[PDB]
Design the sequence.
């Protein structure tokens, strides 16, 4: 049972701008998704300080980066707080209408796309490199859900009967054909070292057979 929703018009406009602006510095998508994972891990850590049972769904707080050249996917997995169904539908827990407005104005005034995370809508930078994005998420207060979009103005949500996650968020980037450099170990390592060196959780880059 799959539900299809329209993006709010401002979010569709954000996505179109990310997809159709000429902008070479695409590697910042990974910094922005790792930043979102760090923020989600901080949230479950803070809740655990007063209620240790919040970690019954998994004590380890960390980030995995999983390239798969056969499937052409890069997956960013975290064991943070996760999202409810309502959060997914409401722009993946962001204030994206207001953040898009501000970002648009900042671009007009001379900012560039790499500054997206200052506007709270860094998730959508995934569309610099991905033709389709799938988000699998599990919050202590909800069931496991899958959100997916190939842009074009709509997204889907379904209950996920895939491999159970425990708690957290997994962002699966189905890469554009010309963006396969982001599956190469040396390239991923270089980007994590350049932009994510002060993230306070382990970031494990998986190896391929
Ligand atoms: Cl808003
Ligand atoms: Mg912040």
Sequence:
């Amino acid at each position: 049972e799959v539900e299809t929703f329209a993006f709010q018009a401002e979010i569709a406009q954000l996505m179109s701008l990310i997809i159709n602006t000429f902008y070479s510095n695409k590697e910042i998508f990974l910094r922005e998704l790792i930043s979102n994972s760090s923020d989600a891990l901080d949230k479950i850590r803070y809740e655990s300080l007063t209620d240790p049972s919040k970690l019954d769904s998994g004590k380890e707080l960390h980030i995995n980066l999983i390239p798969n050249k056969q499937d052409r996917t890069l997956t960013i997995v975290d064991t943070g707080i996760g999202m409810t169904k309502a959060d997914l539908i409401n722009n993946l827990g962001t204030i994206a209408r207001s953040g898009t407005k501000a970002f648009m104005e900042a671009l007009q005034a001379g900012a560039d796309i790499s500054m997206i995370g200052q506007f709270g809508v860094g998730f959508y930078s995934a569309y610099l490199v991905a033709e389709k994005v799938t988000v699998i998420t599990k919050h202590n207060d909800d069931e496991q859900y899958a959100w997916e979009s190939s842009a074009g103005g709509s997204f889907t949500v379904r209950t996920d009967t895939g491999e159970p996650m425990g708690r957290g968020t997994k962002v699966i980037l189905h890469l554009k054909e010309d963006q396969t450099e982001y599956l190469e170990e040396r390239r991923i390592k270089e980007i994590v070292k350049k932009h994510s060196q002060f993230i306070g959780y382990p970031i494990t880059l998986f190896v391929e057979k």
